[PDB]
Structure formats: C-alpha cells, structure tokens
C-alpha cells in the first residue's frame, strides 16, 4: 500500500500520533514489541505457542 501525505490523523493510532507525535508512537510500539515478545508465549496455534516456549531440561 502507498500512504498519501497530509492524512487526517484518526483511529486510536492516529489520535495517539496527534498527541505524542509519530516518532514517540514508533518508540512506544517497539517497547510493546519487547513486552509482547518477552512476557507472552504466543502462536497462531497452540502447537506453535508450545514449541516457542520450550526450554533437554
């Protein structure tokens, strides 16, 4: 997809961007990424979650 400039900032993210600025939103998303990756064991299916959360210990 290609994004046209000067788009009215709507949605939860657009409202976030009007408030904090786009750069801070990117930074907040990267922090959410560390949280999601470190504190959750997730997958599309349970087999994928379970394989990801494995430790012969």
């Amino acid at each position: 997809r290609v994004i046209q400039p000067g788009e009215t900032p709507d949605g939860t993210i657009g409202r976030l961007v009007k408030r904090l600025g786009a750069p801070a939103v990117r930074t907040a998303t990267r922090q959410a990424m560390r949280l999601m990756g470190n504190h959750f064991v997730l997958g599309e299916t349970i087999e994928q979650a379970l394989e990801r959360g494995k430790p012969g210990q």
């Binding site: 904090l20 600025g21 786009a22 750069p23 801070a24 930074t27």
Partner: protein, 56 residues
C-alpha cells in the same frame, strides 16, 4: 547620527495598553500559520523521539 541619551524608559507601564498594540500586530495570514504549525509540529515530534535535567 547622535549618540542616544542615557536610557530611561518607563519602568513598569500598564500591560493592557501594551497588549492593545501587540495583539493586533501579531496577526498572521492562514498560510503563514500553516507553515508555522507544520515546522513546530515537526520540531516537537523530534523532541518527543539521550537525557536532560528536566527529564531527571
């Protein structure tokens, strides 16, 4: 031109009279305000992207 006299402006004039001149003169056309708004938004977006005393 002449060396100016020793500086002696009134010390504490009335704010309202000053505001009566400064308020109309601060007016800016819509495209002037638009450029100001964009530049300033970009500067603040960068600010909100290190460390300073205020942060501590």
């Amino acid at each position: 031109p002449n060396i100016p006299p020793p500086f002696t402006a009134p010390y504490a004039p009335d704010d309202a009279e000053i505001a009566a001149r400064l308020l109309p003169a601060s007016h800016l056309s819509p495209p002037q305000e638009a450029r100001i708004h964009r530049t300033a938004t970009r500067l603040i977006e960068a600010i909100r992207k290190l460390g300073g005393v205020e942060d501590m």
